[PDB]
């Protein structure tokens, strides 16, 4: 029960990344894709708790 927002690139190892995207530094925000071609198992559900 806490929220977090960030944009800095995550370093999975010892590689110093400060704005560049290395092979070990990945962007921690990955987006979806929502098309009618996808079936039931790949569609967005507005889950509310």
């Amino acid at each position, epitope marked *: 029960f806490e929220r977090d927002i960030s*944009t800095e*690139i995550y370093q999975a190892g010892n590689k110093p990344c*400060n*704005g*560049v*995207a290395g092979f070990n530094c990945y*962007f921690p*925000l990955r*987006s979806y*894709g929502f098309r009618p071609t996808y079936g039931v198992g790949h569609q967005p559900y507005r889950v509310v708790v």
Partner: antibody
Amino acid sequence: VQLVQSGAEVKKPGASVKVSCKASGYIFSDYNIHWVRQAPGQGLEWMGWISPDSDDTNYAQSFQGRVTMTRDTSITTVYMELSSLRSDDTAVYFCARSVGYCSLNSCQRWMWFDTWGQGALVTVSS
Amino acid sequence: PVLTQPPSASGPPGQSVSISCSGSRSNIGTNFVYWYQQLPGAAPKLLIYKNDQRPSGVPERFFGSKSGTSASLAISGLRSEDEVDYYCAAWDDSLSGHVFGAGTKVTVL
């Protein structure tokens, strides 16, 4: 996909010009449309995106009130109403087809410009 | 800041050439780089998107990649019958907008 339109007519500075390109072959409720001009000898400039679903269009840092946009759901063609034309407006107008959809300011990195075709030519004149 | 490019490049046919697009940390690497190419007397067209997937409509001839601050578009050989400028574009949080490169002329030798 097609972007067939008509050539833009020459306008005096301190007037208005209209460019609109036809949309067909798809539903015009998912693709935010962009406007852009190809400046000679250099790159291009961006001013904002137009969403045909909700009134949530924004503006860039350097373009506040020079550009004005209105949407249309009956004809599915965006309308352009430019104001205060100057000498640096001497460039051709192409309507930029953008894949996908994006509203907030952290989803636009994934989109890329899809279709260019038969753009308009506009040069403000003495 | 503004993305810059060399005004022109000189590559003879028969050998590979590359085009560099110098940038910064906040525009290149953490944000994807697109490459626009426009025909003379016609409409532009995207060459490569997301620096690793090639669009459908072009054969396996070109190559593009990014390395930190700069991105390289490898052009394996050159045909004398087609000479087309290359544009460099990216995204920057500070300008919260799309900023475009200078553009490059490619010529035969």
